[PDB]
Structure 1
Amino acid sequence: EQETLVRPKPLLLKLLKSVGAQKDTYTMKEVLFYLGQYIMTKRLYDEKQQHIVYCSNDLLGDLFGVPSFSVKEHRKIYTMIYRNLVVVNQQE
């Protein structure tokens, strides 16, 4: 139900392009889903402890500002994604 209309900033947009998403405006749900696919396809999660993402050597690490994080860190994830987009004035 995360329907917030958003326009990713250049870094986030580059990440989205990696999984085939080239539009400029998204729902938050879409951004979140595509970032999950990004992590999957770049194989940035630990194969033995899959909630751990190791992003130091990936562009994702520039977004999050840390070398690693857990998918359990929901507030941090949301926070870092929102700071990398602009919420659209006209919602809906």
Structure 2
Amino acid sequence: QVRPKLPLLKILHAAGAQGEMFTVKEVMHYLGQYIMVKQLYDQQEQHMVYCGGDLLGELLGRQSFSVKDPSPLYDMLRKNLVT
């Protein structure tokens, strides 16, 4: 299990997560929930996420990313999860 740093934890809480400690797969689940709540994916190209001007974009250091490429997400998790 992992404990997210605060900005990432606030994203998880916005999407319904409770508490401070999670499995990696729970973190990934709640990131997906957040993207759906905030409607960040392109309805017409649903693997593309446009996160510019969202806290998620700040954490990723990205304006957009493809869900098909896990690399920017993994990089962010390495920096934002404490084990």
Do the two structures share a fold, i.e. TM-score over 0.5?
yes
The 1-side partners of 2:3 and 2:65 are apart by 24
Kindly report structure 1 stretches of 4+ aligned residues shifted beyond 4 Å: none
Residue equivalent to 1:80:
76
Letter in 1 for 2:60: F
Letter in 1 for 2:17: A
The 2-side partners of 1:56 and 1:66 are apart by 7
Query: Which structure shows the bigger proportion of residues in helix conformation?
Result: 2
Offset of residue 42 of structure 1? 0.6
The 1-side partners of 2:8 and 2:78 are apart by 10
Pick the structure with greater CA Rg. 1
| Residue 14 of structure 1 pairs with residue 15 of structure 2 | no
The counterpart of 2:58, out of the listed 40, 57, 62, is: 62
% identical aligned pairs: 57
Offset of residue 22 of structure 1? 2.6
Offset of residue 79 of structure 1? 2.0
| Residue 39 of structure 1 pairs with residue 35 of structure 2 | yes
Task: Write the deviation string for residues 21-49 of structure 1: whole angstroms up to 9, x where unpaired.
Answer: 13110000100010011101110000000
| Residue 71 of structure 1 pairs with residue 64 of structure 2 | no
The 1-side partners of 2:4 and 2:49 are apart by 21
Task: Write the deviation string for residues 9-68 of structure 1: whole angstroms up to 9, x where unpaired.
Answer: 011001001012131100001000100111011100000000110000211111101111
Cα RMSD (Å): 0.9
